[PDB]
Scaffold this active site. Sequence first.
Site, PDB file in Angstrom:
ATOM      1  N   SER A 197      49.724  17.651 -34.840  1.00 21.62           N
ATOM      2  CA  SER A 197      48.452  17.878 -34.122  1.00 21.62           C
ATOM      3  C   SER A 197      47.575  16.622 -34.263  1.00 21.62           C
ATOM      4  O   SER A 197      48.007  15.549 -33.806  1.00 21.62           O
ATOM      5  CB  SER A 197      47.785  19.191 -34.603  1.00 21.62           C
ATOM      6  OG  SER A 197      46.711  19.613 -33.778  1.00 21.62           O
ATOM      7  N   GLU A 324      51.464  26.340 -27.393  1.00 16.89           N
ATOM      8  CA  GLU A 324      50.481  25.468 -28.015  1.00 16.89           C
ATOM      9  C   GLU A 324      49.050  25.977 -27.809  1.00 16.89           C
ATOM     10  O   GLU A 324      48.184  25.671 -28.623  1.00 16.89           O
ATOM     11  CB  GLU A 324      50.617  24.024 -27.487  1.00 16.89           C
ATOM     12  CG  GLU A 324      51.947  23.298 -27.824  1.00 16.89           C
ATOM     13  CD  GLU A 324      52.042  22.803 -29.263  1.00 16.89           C
ATOM     14  OE1 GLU A 324      51.142  23.082 -30.067  1.00 16.89           O
ATOM     15  OE2 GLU A 324      53.041  22.129 -29.609  1.00 16.89           O
ATOM     16  N   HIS A 437      50.968  26.728 -32.274  1.00 18.79           N
ATOM     17  CA  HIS A 437      50.498  25.444 -32.770  1.00 18.79           C
ATOM     18  C   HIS A 437      50.515  25.427 -34.299  1.00 18.79           C
ATOM     19  O   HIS A 437      49.777  26.175 -34.937  1.00 18.79           O
ATOM     20  CB  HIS A 437      49.064  25.230 -32.269  1.00 18.79           C
ATOM     21  CG  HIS A 437      48.579  23.825 -32.393  1.00 18.79           C
ATOM     22  ND1 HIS A 437      49.169  22.770 -31.723  1.00 18.79           N
ATOM     23  CD2 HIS A 437      47.537  23.299 -33.079  1.00 18.79           C
ATOM     24  CE1 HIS A 437      48.511  21.656 -31.993  1.00 18.79           C
ATOM     25  NE2 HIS A 437      47.518  21.950 -32.814  1.00 18.79           N
TER      26      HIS A 437
HETATM   27  P1  LIG Z   1      45.472  20.273 -34.610  1.00 19.17           P
HETATM   28  C1  LIG Z   1      44.308  20.742 -33.324  1.00 19.17           C
HETATM   29  O1  LIG Z   1      44.874  19.216 -35.482  1.00 19.17           O
HETATM   30  O2  LIG Z   1      45.817  21.718 -35.383  1.00 19.17           O
HETATM   31  C2  LIG Z   1      45.776  22.126 -36.790  1.00 19.17           C
HETATM   32  C3  LIG Z   1      46.761  21.357 -37.713  1.00 19.17           C
HETATM   33  C4  LIG Z   1      46.091  23.654 -36.928  1.00 19.17           C
HETATM   34  C5  LIG Z   1      45.455  24.215 -38.190  1.00 19.17           C
HETATM   35  C6  LIG Z   1      47.607  23.844 -37.012  1.00 19.17           C
HETATM   36  C7  LIG Z   1      45.549  24.446 -35.743  1.00 19.17           C
END
Ligand SMILES: *[P@](C)(=O)O[C@H](C)C(C)(C)C
EC number: 3.1.1.7
Lengths: 532, 532
Positions: A197, A324, A437
């Site tokens: 991410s 996602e 995600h």
């Molecule tokens: P991305 C938007 O940085 O997502 C983070 C790691 C999670 C906690 C998995 C949603």
Amino acid sequence: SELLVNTKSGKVMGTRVPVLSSHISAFLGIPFAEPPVGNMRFRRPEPKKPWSGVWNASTYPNNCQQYVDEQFPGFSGSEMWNPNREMSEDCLYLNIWVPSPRPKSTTVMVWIYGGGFYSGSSTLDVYNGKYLAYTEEVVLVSLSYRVGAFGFLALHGSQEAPGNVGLLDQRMALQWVHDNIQFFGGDPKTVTIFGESAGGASVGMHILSPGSRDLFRRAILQSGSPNCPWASVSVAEGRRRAVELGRNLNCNLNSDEELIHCLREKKPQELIDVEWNVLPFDSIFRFSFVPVIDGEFFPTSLESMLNSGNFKKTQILLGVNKDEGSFFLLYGAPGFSKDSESKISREDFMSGVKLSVPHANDLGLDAVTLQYTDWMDDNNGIKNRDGLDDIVGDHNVICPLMHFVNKYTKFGNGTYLYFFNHRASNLVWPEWMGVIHGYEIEFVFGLPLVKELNYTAEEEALSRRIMHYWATFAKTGNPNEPHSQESKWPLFTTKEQKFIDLNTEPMKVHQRLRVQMCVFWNQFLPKLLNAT
Amino acid sequence: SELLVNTKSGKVMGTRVPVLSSHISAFLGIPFAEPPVGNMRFRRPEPKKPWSGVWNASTYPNNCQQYVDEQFPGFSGSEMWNPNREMSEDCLYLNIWVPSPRPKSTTVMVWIYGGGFYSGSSTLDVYNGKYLAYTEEVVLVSLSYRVGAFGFLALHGSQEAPGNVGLLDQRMALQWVHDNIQFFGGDPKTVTIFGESAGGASVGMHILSPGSRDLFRRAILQSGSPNCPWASVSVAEGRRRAVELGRNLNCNLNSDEELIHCLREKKPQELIDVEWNVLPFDSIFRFSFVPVIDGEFFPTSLESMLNSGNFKKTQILLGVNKDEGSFFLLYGAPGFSKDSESKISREDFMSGVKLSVPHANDLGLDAVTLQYTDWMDDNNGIKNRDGLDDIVGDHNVICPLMHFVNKYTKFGNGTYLYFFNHRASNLVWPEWMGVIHGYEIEFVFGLPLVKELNYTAEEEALSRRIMHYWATFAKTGNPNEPHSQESKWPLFTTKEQKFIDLNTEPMKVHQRLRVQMCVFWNQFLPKLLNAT
Ligand SMILES: *[P@](C)(=O)O[C@H](C)C(C)(C)C
Ligand SMILES: *[C@@H]1O[C@H](CO)[C@@H](O[C@@H]2O[C@H](CO)[C@@H](O)[C@H](O)[C@H]2NC(C)=O)[C@H](O)[C@H]1NC(C)=O
Ligand SMILES: *[C@@H]1O[C@H](CO[C@@H]2O[C@@H](C)[C@@H](O)[C@@H](O)[C@@H]2O)[C@@H](O)[C@H](O)[C@H]1NC(C)=O
Ligand SMILES: *[P@](C)(=O)O[C@H](C)C(C)(C)C
Ligand SMILES: [Cl-]
Ligand SMILES: [Cl-]
């Protein structure tokens, strides 16, 4: 002593940790920068001054100051992402897992946590490097970096709050690994950076930034790419949000010097409490303090860098999960809730579209709606819910990543693309959210090898397969074992655009990941928006 | 005598014509207006002055002056649409087929030929009214009207060339039918007007025009609707094209009076030879001299009339063929030819898109391309060829008709929708063209009942089924026989949007004809174009 290592910064003493009926060495909480506290808040990191005596590296460090998710108190699905140590501005530390006996010159993998640049911790159970280090015989490092305003408040032109300091925290940890990993038995010429991410975006940003390129060998990007619409802002937008933060805290706004001074006097929680108030739009999947396109860390726009091949040319392995979008819809969009199937009305669909593409004008919103509505069956609540998942996932993760992969592959030295689509048997989130995600991470780190965690046999096998792809890739630039009989993960090429799925079923090769929707997101919509 | 009829205009003598082992009466070439010749060129029609003695109505009349297709000399597929009688400006005549013995007060159907407003003839073999009149026991009338510049040259503000005179020719024929059909055994209160393509558009235009509404009872529209993008122009555009015609013929252009006088001196063929030169764009499915939105025949814009229910409220039956685009692509687009499968390259696709949507800007063209390209398989020549057929068909015929049906159905008294998708066993055109624009007409007119024409048994049955739907609809406002056991053609409603297919297989009911693409053509694209 296996647990004593001398480094250029001083001696460190680690700890023997049990892992899967065996043991390895862990060196936890090694400092790589000076504490960015007081007048050092918002400033570029300074190298850690060497110490005398033996640094006690037996315990996890503090986590950086961050917004803490309290949306579902006590629920493991959400709390697994929250800081599990005390929060401190004194948080610039790294962790190293080392095979036993200590290797001589082995492959190194450096993990960069995600969290939308506003959160994240190196210490999460899900990032426990012991299983991967043990199973694949790599030196596994996890770094940390300042998040939120502490890492990314940007007042371009100021040297006191220039922006990008969290990315510079990451680079300084990479510098320390470059300089010192040999003493832990790591090969500094075979370092793979990997992240998910925002950590995946970050990995791409180090690929791009001339000042980072020389510090690693190759790269893995999970559900993140440097060109994601949430991953950077202009210097004007960064400035606007910094001033708006000051306004929320009743700061003197007459100069950068006055604003920064006011902001430095505040307790960390004071900044965090108003952080979300500076966003320019009613949005989901947008975060307040993020990397800034500054002309230094990033010499030009990300698009021009990608178009001209202005980036590190090496091998990359990267990919995305099936669903996602669902995390952000659950938290941010009307009609979505944790304990229902979240069937979505036509009206909540429209509200969702608007939140998902906050920068679009009305024509752009019509374009998105048309692209994702089944007009033969427009009142179907499941289709509307799934449509929104796709909109959010495609716009924020999959299509930016696909644009990156196609630009990169023209100049790079080898691309491997995956689509992770296994729904874990023990997932605590509702079924409607699908393959969420962040939920490949547990497979990458080998959690399914742990008996007490209640994964299936097939899930352990999937995890072993993934760990082996990732580590073999880190070792050689190719996830495939030479002369093994197993089915091969083909190279992604401009011409054939192949990728593999990652699930408990026999591997299949596919082509042109979400190509139809990504032409919409990458070519048509930006043109529409630029014209109107 | 069965062949002698006295009318308000004078006596007419018809002819006994054989039909399917029987006979009926035909009255061919009855005048309904004064010859629109000399100084009457471009002017509104004048009622035919009554005659003494007996008008010889035993033979087909002259056809109106028109462009003649010479693209495939001697080929029946194209020549079947060409005038088969001498061309003359003296061409305002109608034809009537009357059951034997003469009926007392039977249902009347009035056919309005198509031909893009630039061509057409009442006398074509394919419009022979004898089979329908005989089989279904209706009085079948075919009218004629001036086409091309003779019918549609528009210099708004002038009384000498006001525009719409071909539509007024049609209305005058309807007036004559209203006034005189009773003497042929027709019921003037149960007249159905029906037409295909431009004739279908024309039928819709009589539904809309206050000055036409009272002259008929109900209406059938085949592959045509009044709002089709080719079916009308503004008064400014009509004026521009009229002046451009004058420019081509080296006319004095200083006033309407000078221009009209020059144009009236020219031989008909002189006008026809330069007719195609006045189009504003490089286009297909666009014609030079068409109905003009004049504030008289059409009091306001077609869209405002449809939106406010400013039209005749009655029952309608209408529909489209599977491959409406292929005729015009064959004639007008690169890559398409009569004697090959016409597989279409990506490059010829792009050229085709531009020709098909000549009024679109570059963004609009991108929108169309994205909507009709399979990006998983974009070099597929069949898919590209079929994509173009759909673009041309959807934009020019199907989507305008769907927009009409949905607007009409809100105020009307009953809508029946069909999708004709039978490829005739004896079709002379190539297979790639599919179910062509115009090729339902032969079924509507009962040609498959004629042994020598080599249709299959199933095709005869289909024709009988269609003739019976059309005639039962003309009789009652409903194509279904009350209390028959056959499967029912359901009413099209705003809510369920049902329609039937028309082919040799058992009838199926479907819903929401091409709804996805028609939202693009009817809602999104016009908004995109109006914004950019
Ligand atoms: P991305 C938007 O940085 O997502 C983070 C790691 C999670 C906690 C998995 C949603
Ligand atoms: C990655 O880079 C290497 C080295 O530049 C490429 O290998 C060379 O390829 C050329 C063309 O086939 C050969 O002439 C050289 O002999 C190769 N060198 C070596 C050391 O093998 C390689 O093709 C690149 N791989 C990809 C997938 O782009
Ligand atoms: C190294 O540290 C080990 C664990 O320490 C614990 O955490 C730190 C921050 C302190 O709060 C301490 O009181 C805790 O026990 C110790 O078990 C170990 O003895 C230490 N070793 C040396 C040589 O100091
Ligand atoms: P429309 C465009 O008026 O079509 C005519 C009737 C045909 C000859 C069938 C193409
Ligand atoms: Cl799902
Ligand atoms: Cl076909």
